[PDB]
Enzyme design. Structure first.
Site, PDB file in Angstrom:
ATOM      1  N   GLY A  36       0.622  -1.022  -0.005  1.00 27.72           N
ATOM      2  CA  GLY A  36      -0.128  -0.005   0.069  1.00 27.72           C
ATOM      3  C   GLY A  36       0.762   1.276   0.070  1.00 27.72           C
ATOM      4  O   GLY A  36       2.163   1.314   0.421  1.00 27.72           O
ATOM      5  N   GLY A  41       4.005   7.520   2.909  1.00 28.32           N
ATOM      6  CA  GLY A  41       4.799   6.327   2.952  1.00 28.32           C
ATOM      7  C   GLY A  41       4.438   5.330   1.887  1.00 28.32           C
ATOM      8  O   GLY A  41       3.346   5.389   1.119  1.00 28.32           O
ATOM      9  N   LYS A  58       7.237   0.007   6.376  1.00 24.51           N
ATOM     10  CA  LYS A  58       6.825   1.276   6.040  1.00 24.51           C
ATOM     11  C   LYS A  58       8.141   2.151   5.685  1.00 24.51           C
ATOM     12  O   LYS A  58       8.788   2.172   6.643  1.00 24.51           O
ATOM     13  CB  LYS A  58       5.912   2.034   7.159  1.00 24.51           C
ATOM     14  CG  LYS A  58       5.287   3.554   6.702  1.00 24.51           C
ATOM     15  CD  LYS A  58       4.417   3.993   7.697  1.00 24.51           C
ATOM     16  CE  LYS A  58       3.905   5.223   6.964  1.00 24.51           C
ATOM     17  NZ  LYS A  58       2.534   5.721   7.783  1.00 24.51           N
ATOM     18  N   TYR A 108       3.348  -8.111   9.727  1.00 27.56           N
ATOM     19  CA  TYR A 108       2.528  -7.966   8.051  1.00 27.56           C
ATOM     20  C   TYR A 108       0.948  -8.693   8.646  1.00 27.56           C
ATOM     21  O   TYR A 108       1.007  -9.595   9.142  1.00 27.56           O
ATOM     22  CB  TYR A 108       3.204  -8.909   7.433  1.00 27.56           C
ATOM     23  CG  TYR A 108       2.423  -9.330   5.849  1.00 27.56           C
ATOM     24  CD1 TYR A 108       1.672  -8.344   5.165  1.00 27.56           C
ATOM     25  CD2 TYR A 108       2.128 -10.370   5.293  1.00 27.56           C
ATOM     26  CE1 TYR A 108       0.831  -8.522   4.384  1.00 27.56           C
ATOM     27  CE2 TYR A 108       1.804 -10.768   4.615  1.00 27.56           C
ATOM     28  CZ  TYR A 108       0.963  -9.725   3.849  1.00 27.56           C
ATOM     29  OH  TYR A 108       0.029  -9.931   2.762  1.00 27.56           O
ATOM     30  N   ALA A 110      -1.968  -9.822   7.130  1.00 28.43           N
ATOM     31  CA  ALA A 110      -2.197 -10.354   5.769  1.00 28.43           C
ATOM     32  C   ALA A 110      -3.743 -10.229   4.863  1.00 28.43           C
ATOM     33  O   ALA A 110      -3.944 -10.758   4.021  1.00 28.43           O
ATOM     34  CB  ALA A 110      -1.701 -11.709   5.679  1.00 28.43           C
ATOM     35  N   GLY A 112      -5.815  -7.793   4.558  1.00 34.31           N
ATOM     36  CA  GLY A 112      -5.896  -6.663   3.638  1.00 34.31           C
ATOM     37  C   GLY A 112      -6.458  -5.627   4.505  1.00 34.31           C
ATOM     38  O   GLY A 112      -6.850  -5.682   5.488  1.00 34.31           O
ATOM     39  N   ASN A 157      -7.042   2.259   7.129  1.00 31.73           N
ATOM     40  CA  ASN A 157      -5.996   2.266   7.961  1.00 31.73           C
ATOM     41  C   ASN A 157      -6.304   1.088   8.811  1.00 31.73           C
ATOM     42  O   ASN A 157      -5.831   1.159  10.024  1.00 31.73           O
ATOM     43  CB  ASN A 157      -5.913   3.527   8.996  1.00 31.73           C
ATOM     44  CG  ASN A 157      -5.079   4.729   7.966  1.00 31.73           C
ATOM     45  OD1 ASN A 157      -4.661   4.475   7.069  1.00 31.73           O
ATOM     46  ND2 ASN A 157      -5.062   5.857   8.674  1.00 31.73           N
ATOM     47  N   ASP A 170      -0.937   2.777  10.805  1.00 32.99           N
ATOM     48  CA  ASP A 170      -0.803   4.382  10.508  1.00 32.99           C
ATOM     49  C   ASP A 170      -1.345   5.434  11.607  1.00 32.99           C
ATOM     50  O   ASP A 170      -2.283   5.900  12.018  1.00 32.99           O
ATOM     51  CB  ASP A 170      -1.718   4.757   9.436  1.00 32.99           C
ATOM     52  CG  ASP A 170      -1.239   5.922   8.624  1.00 32.99           C
ATOM     53  OD1 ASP A 170      -0.327   6.772   9.457  1.00 32.99           O
ATOM     54  OD2 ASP A 170      -2.044   6.692   7.702  1.00 32.99           O
TER      55      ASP A 170
HETATM   56  N1  LIG Z   1       1.281  -3.846   8.997  1.00 34.83           N
HETATM   57  C1  LIG Z   1       0.622  -3.782   7.827  1.00 34.83           C
HETATM   58  N2  LIG Z   1       0.446  -4.861   7.129  1.00 34.83           N
HETATM   59  C2  LIG Z   1      -0.126  -4.785   5.796  1.00 34.83           C
HETATM   60  N3  LIG Z   1      -0.377  -3.832   5.366  1.00 34.83           N
HETATM   61  C3  LIG Z   1      -0.081  -2.440   5.822  1.00 34.83           C
HETATM   62  C4  LIG Z   1       0.436  -2.363   7.140  1.00 34.83           C
HETATM   63  N4  LIG Z   1       0.501  -1.079   7.478  1.00 34.83           N
HETATM   64  C5  LIG Z   1       0.040  -0.379   6.473  1.00 34.83           C
HETATM   65  N5  LIG Z   1      -0.122  -1.363   5.350  1.00 34.83           N
HETATM   66  C6  LIG Z   1      -0.804  -0.926   4.179  1.00 34.83           C
HETATM   67  O1  LIG Z   1       0.019   0.387   3.674  1.00 34.83           O
HETATM   68  C7  LIG Z   1      -0.910   1.294   3.285  1.00 34.83           C
HETATM   69  C8  LIG Z   1      -0.070   2.783   3.810  1.00 34.83           C
HETATM   70  O2  LIG Z   1       0.432   2.624   5.042  1.00 34.83           O
HETATM   71  P1  LIG Z   1       0.146   3.921   5.856  1.00 34.83           P
HETATM   72  O3  LIG Z   1      -1.350   4.067   6.095  1.00 34.83           O
HETATM   73  O4  LIG Z   1       0.918   3.741   7.119  1.00 34.83           O
HETATM   74  O5  LIG Z   1       0.585   5.058   4.897  1.00 34.83           O
HETATM   75  P2  LIG Z   1       0.262   6.505   4.969  1.00 34.83           P
HETATM   76  O6  LIG Z   1       1.360   7.213   3.701  1.00 34.83           O
HETATM   77  O7  LIG Z   1       0.618   7.026   6.401  1.00 34.83           O
HETATM   78  O8  LIG Z   1      -1.004   6.930   4.696  1.00 34.83           O
HETATM   79  P3  LIG Z   1      -2.277   8.068   4.624  1.00 34.83           P
HETATM   80  O9  LIG Z   1      -2.431   8.772   3.339  1.00 34.83           O
HETATM   81  O10 LIG Z   1      -3.571   7.319   5.101  1.00 34.83           O
HETATM   82  O11 LIG Z   1      -1.625   8.929   5.715  1.00 34.83           O
HETATM   83  C9  LIG Z   1      -2.181   0.994   4.367  1.00 34.83           C
HETATM   84  O12 LIG Z   1      -3.205   1.952   3.978  1.00 34.83           O
HETATM   85  C10 LIG Z   1      -2.220  -0.391   3.993  1.00 34.83           C
HETATM   86  O13 LIG Z   1      -2.677  -0.728   3.005  1.00 34.83           O
HETATM   87 MN   LIG Z   2      -0.823   8.520   7.573  1.00 36.65          MN
HETATM   88 MN   LIG Z   3      -2.914   5.548   6.121  1.00 38.88          MN
END
Ligand SMILES: Nc1ncnc2c1ncn2[C@@H]1O[C@H](COP(=O)(O)OP(=O)(O)OP(=O)(O)O)[C@@H](O)[C@H]1O
Ligand SMILES: [Mn+2]
Ligand SMILES: [Mn+2]
Lengths: 336, 19
Positions: A36, A41, A58, A108, A110, A112, A157, A170
């Site tokens: 994602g 990130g 991340k 992780y 898994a 989704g 999230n 997140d």
């Molecule tokens: N521990 C995890 N296991 C599996 N997938 C994850 C995990 N953490 C995050 N993800 C996936 O990665 C994506 C992005 O991570 P995250 O939400 O931390 O990024 P962000 O850039 O902070 O997003 P936002 O735009 O909401 O601020 C999540 O929406 C999810 O699909």
């Molecule tokens: Mn975020």
């Molecule tokens: Mn997010």
């Protein structure tokens, strides 16, 4: 509940005061596939070489974090995530940094995003929505007790684990604050009116966001939607909410009390605090201790093929992870 | 219907945080 939270705070404060640092390095992992992305990130499935375990890494580009004015937010995110401990919060396993990037390696999850399942299925039954909602209520009770505000509740999230339970990810906007705060942050559909109106706000914004989440889970669409954020904010501030014909009277009552513009009337923010929510008729069938102990049968369990299976995630365009020979933003992220 | 209006809208995909 009150003894539990007291001990939980002691544990949190020890880690808050002396955070973990530099507990892995990039070459200890083989990067497999992007799970994602977001505004900040990229999260990648990785395999840890020495253990063979899969994790979700991340990756934050330091220069992008600075550009988007997320320095303090990112330091908050790591400091808080390494300190918390709750059954529905994703576990931070390692964190580290190199010349170019910041890395937070999580368990992780898994199954989704809740988001993908919700969009595909259309909407969740009330018992299905209630199961997830109960986990969020308990998680907010925990976080708020530590003086933390979360500020980015949304299905994107929220991850579903192998037992069908939620893992909140997140912590990018999470903050430890005892008074009011003022930052305009979150995701448009989930913003409380007091954030939009540039007022000081507090943890009551998380309870508003829970109202939005429950609505979206049960309806299949958010209570305030439009093509552009500005149009969404106008709807939120008006506060007028219409409910699907299939919503129970109990659900509608709960949501009227959560999606309440008046802070003196919003559930979660009154004298009885979270108990106004826990004791609401919509949650009458909820065994709160059983949920915490993860003894309740999940209404939906995603399909799991094997270790490293990413079938429950969308595909994303991959990009080379670049690391400069020159250190970027060294002083800014010293404490990371 | 509200559903039809939502599905025809520009925000049915993943929503990233404001920045
Ligand atoms: N521990 C995890 N296991 C599996 N997938 C994850 C995990 N953490 C995050 N993800 C996936 O990665 C994506 C992005 O991570 P995250 O939400 O931390 O990024 P962000 O850039 O902070 O997003 P936002 O735009 O909401 O601020 C999540 O929406 C999810 O699909
Ligand atoms: Mn975020
Ligand atoms: Mn997010």
């Amino acid at each position: 509940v009150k003894e539990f939270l007291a001990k939980a705070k002691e544990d949190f404060l020890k880690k808050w005061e002396t955070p973990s640092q530099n507990t892995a390095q990039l070459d200890q992992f083989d990067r497999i596939k992007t799970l994602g992305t977001g505004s900040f990130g990229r999260v990648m499935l990785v395999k840890h070489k020495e253990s063979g375990n899969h994790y979700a890494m991340k990756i934050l580009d330091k220069q992008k974090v600075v550009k988007l004015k997320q320095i303090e937010h990112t330091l908050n995110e790591k400091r808080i995530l390494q300190a918390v401990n709750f059954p529905f919060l994703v576990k931070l396993e390692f964190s580290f940094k190199d010349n170019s990037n910041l890395y937070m390696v999580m368990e992780y999850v898994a199954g989704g995003e809740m988001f993908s399942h919700l969009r595909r299925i259309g909407r969740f039954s009330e018992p299905h929505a209630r199961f997830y909602a109960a986990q969020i209520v308990l998680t907010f009770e925990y976080l708020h007790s530590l003086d933390l505000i979360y500020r980015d509740l949304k299905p994107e999230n929220l991850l579903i684990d192998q037992q069908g339970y939620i893992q909140v990810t997140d912590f990018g906007f999470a903050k430890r604050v005892k008074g009011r705060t003022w930052t305009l942050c979150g995701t448009p559909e989930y913003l409380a009116p007091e954030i939009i109106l540039s007022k000081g706000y507090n943890k009551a914004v998380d309870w508003w966001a829970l109202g939005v989440l429950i609505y979206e889970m049960a309806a299949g669409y958010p209570p305030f939607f439009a093509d552009q954020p500005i149009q969404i904010y106008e709807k939120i501030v008006s506060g007028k909410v219409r409910f699907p014909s299939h919503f129970s009277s109990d659900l509608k009552d709960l949501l009227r009390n959560l999606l309440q513009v008046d802070l003196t009337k919003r559930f979660g923010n009154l004298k009885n605090g979270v108990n106004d929510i826990k004791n609401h008729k919509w949650f009458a069938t909820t065994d709160w201790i059983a949920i915490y102990q993860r003894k309740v049968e999940a209404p939906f369990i995603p399909k799991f093929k094997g270790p490293g299976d990413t079938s429950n995630f969308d595909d994303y365009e991959e990009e080379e992870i670049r690391v400069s020979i020159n250190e970027k933003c060294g002083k800014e992220f010293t404490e990371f | 219907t509200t559903y039809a209006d939502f599905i025809a809208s520009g925000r049915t995909g993943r929503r990233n945080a404001i920045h």
